[PDB]
Amino acid sequence: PLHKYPVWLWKRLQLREGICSRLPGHYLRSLEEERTPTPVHYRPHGAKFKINPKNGQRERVEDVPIPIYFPPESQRGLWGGEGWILGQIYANNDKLSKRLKKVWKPQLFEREFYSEILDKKFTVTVTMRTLDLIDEAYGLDFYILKTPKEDLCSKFGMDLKRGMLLRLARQDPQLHPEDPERRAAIYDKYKEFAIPEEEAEWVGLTLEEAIEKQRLLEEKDPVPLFKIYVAELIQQLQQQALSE
């Protein structure tokens, strides 16, 4: 036989049933959106049309991203979108020679970063690209908030984003409790990234984490039927008195 829906649509159907239905709309739209990551291991053409050198004709060109493998240890650091490149090479760059397996690994470094919003220092494994992105963003706090989810390529980076967004959303007074003037200055510096606290709590959460969080919010002890029946009995007696 045949399935009513295509197989690749089964995942999206599951989001319309069960506990995933009751997830916040703003969170669900984030999962549906799939932006193209900033090119890292390949150079984009930069133009939609190029003149072919041979026939001298205008031919459409497209950017095909290089597949990237992110090791699980990359989720505990900030690699800046870099990852392992699992591919093939030709010996001596000659197509008539053997096709060998080649893996390109980023050079990882251990660095300590201070977050102004979080008022804490983190020892994060980063690459040289991550340092450049932070330098171009003028600070770690700007880099975390500005960089999209698809470009961070790190669960820890998204967790840092949620922490910063929560403090900005709440105007949390735990940041320098004894210096109210200094606390307001930092919040004013990053006021452009402020979002409502309801949305900030769901930023960076995976589907499994969101489901568990939603389940806990909806988890409540059932109301005993004694209390429910008392309310109906009391209401009905009042209505009887009015008719009399």
């Binding site: 829906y5 649509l9 999206r12 159907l13």
Partner: protein, 32 residues
């Protein structure tokens, strides 16, 4: 017997439901 009514092209524009996943993507764009 009597023949069934002839199959006719249904009058009026056909607007697919945008909220249906089985709706083809080409029937939802501005070009359609």
């Amino acid at each position: 017997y009597r023949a069934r009514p002839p199959p006719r092209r249904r009058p009026g524009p056909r607007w697919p439901d945008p909220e249906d996943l089985l709706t083809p993507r080409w029937q939802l764009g501005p070009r359609y």
